[PDB]
Ligand binder design. Structure first.
Ligand SMILES: CC(=O)N[C@@H]1[C@@H](O)[C@H](O[C@@H]2O[C@H](CO)[C@H](O)[C@H](O)[C@H]2O)[C@@H](CO)O[C@@H]1O
Ligand SMILES: CC(=O)N[C@@H]1[C@@H](O)[C@H](O[C@@H]2O[C@H](CO)[C@H](O)[C@H](O)[C@H]2O)[C@@H](CO)O[C@@H]1O
Lengths: 134, 134
């Protein structure tokens, strides 16, 4: 809303990727990028937390099924700074989604539901600059 | 009707613009780019008609309020070719929307309802590559 674009009919199929460019509000405790079927089912919820729910400078990744959050996965890397810009790429593969940052860092997250395509994308706490898929 | 990628909470403000990049299918009768508040209320409906509604290689712009279309503005320039990629920018000013083409072609359409920001964007018949805001 404030910072929360939603893309529908994304049509992201295996072997393709979507890159997001945004800027992080100074008053932001964290931002999230969600990839899924709709607002209640996320294949991937990528949440960079600066100071949120007890996590300080930690990336929490999870899936959501029918509004019930899955098994969280946490990552050590955190190449973000408030007020700075952000460039993340998500590469969708049938067996995993690989997240890459402009910083050169990368990690993978398991695909818990093989979908023919990912129709929905939404951002939270991120001021949208550009979205592009290949 | 829209049918293609849709973006909500785009919230394009006066003085800013969106750049849309995509591919025109090789058998495209026409395509459209919509900016408004929702699917039934458009500040601008930009329809490039290759062979559609009796029009051949025509650009027809109009607004829509509660599903009722307003008065059409027709343009003489048609800088598009089927099967090719399009790059079109929309600058939002309070008195008008300037429509710019990569080909340098440019024209404006009047703002018939001044909104503090445009929250919705939708594509029709165009294969999406990137959406960028400035
Ligand atoms: C250590 C731990 O278990 N922490 C969790 C929180 O992460 C969790 O917060 C939600 O987490 C999901 C992702 O799994 C979304 O980020 C959501 O926005 C968060 O509120 C809460 C609630 O499930 O439980 C523990 O605190
Ligand atoms: C010559 C003429 O008046 N033609 C119009 C059509 O343009 C019009 O088609 C609709 O046009 C709006 C744009 O103003 C949208 O593109 C819509 O999708 C079209 O169906 C029709 C119907 O309103 O009216 C005349 O035929």
């Amino acid at each position: 809303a404030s910072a929360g674009v939603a893309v529908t009919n994304l049509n992201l199929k295996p072997g393709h990727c979507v890159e997001i460019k945004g800027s992080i509000p100074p008053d932001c405790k964290g931002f999230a990028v969600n990839l899924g079927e709709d607002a209640s089912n996320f294949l991937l919820h990528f949440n960079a937390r600066f100071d949120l729910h007890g996590d300080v400078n930690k990336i929490v990744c999870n899936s959501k099924e029918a509004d019930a959050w899955g098994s969280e996965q946490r990552e050590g890397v955190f190449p973000f700074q408030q007020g700075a810009e952000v460039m993340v790429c998500f590469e969708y593969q049938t067996d995993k989604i690989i997240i890459k940052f402009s910083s050169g860092d990368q990690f993978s997250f398991p695909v818990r539901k093989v979908l023919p395509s990912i129709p929905f994308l939404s951002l939270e706490g991120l001021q949208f600059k550009s979205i592009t898929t290949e």
